[PDB]
Amino acid sequence: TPWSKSELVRQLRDLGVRSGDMVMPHVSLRAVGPLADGPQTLVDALIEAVGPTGNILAFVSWRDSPYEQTLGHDAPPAAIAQSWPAFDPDHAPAYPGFGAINEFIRTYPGCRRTAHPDASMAAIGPDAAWLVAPHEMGAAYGPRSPIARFLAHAGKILSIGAGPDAVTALHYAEAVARIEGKRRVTYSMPLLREGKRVWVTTSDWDSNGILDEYAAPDGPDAVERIARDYLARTRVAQGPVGGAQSRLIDAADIVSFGIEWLEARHAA
Kindly determine how many residues on this chain lie close enough to bind ligand SIS according to the rule CB under 6 A: 16
145 annotated ligand-binding residue: no
In the complex with ligand SIS, the residue whose CB is nearer, 3 or 95, is 95
Over the window 8 to 37, marking each residue x when it contacts ligand COA by CB under 6 A and - when it does not, the resulting string is ------------------xxxxxx------
In the complex with ligand SIS, the residue whose CB is nearer, 55 or 65, is 65
127 annotated ligand-binding residue: yes
Spatial contact of 183 and 207, defined as CB atoms under 8 Å apart: no
**DSSP assignments along 209-268, one per residue:** -SSGGG--TTS--HHHHHHHHHHHHS--EEEEETTEEEEEEEHHHHHHHHHHHHHHHS--
Per CB under 6 A, contacts with ligand SIS among 221-240 are 221, 223
The two beta strands, 184-193 and 156-160, are unpaired
d(CA 256, CA 205): 18
Q: Which does 26 bind (CB under 5 to 8 A by kind): ligand COA, ligand SIS, none?
A: ligand COA
Spatial contact of 154 and 252, defined as CB atoms under 8 Å apart: yes
In the complex with ligand COA, the residue whose CB is nearer, 74 or 218, is 218
Question: Closest approach of Cβ 77 to ligand COA, in Å?
Answer: 26
Return the residue of 163, 220, 240, 243 that touches ligand COA, per CB under 6 A: 163
23 annotated ligand-binding residue: no
Task: Please choose, from the candidates 14, 17, 32, 29, the residue with its C-alpha nearest in 3D space to the C-alpha of residue 250.
Answer: 17
Which residues in this chain contact ligand SIS in the complex, by CB under 6 A?
A: 61, 65, 67-68, 95, 118, 165-166, 168, 207-209, 217, 219, 221, 223
Which residues participate in the annotated binding site? 26-30, 100, 127, 168, 171
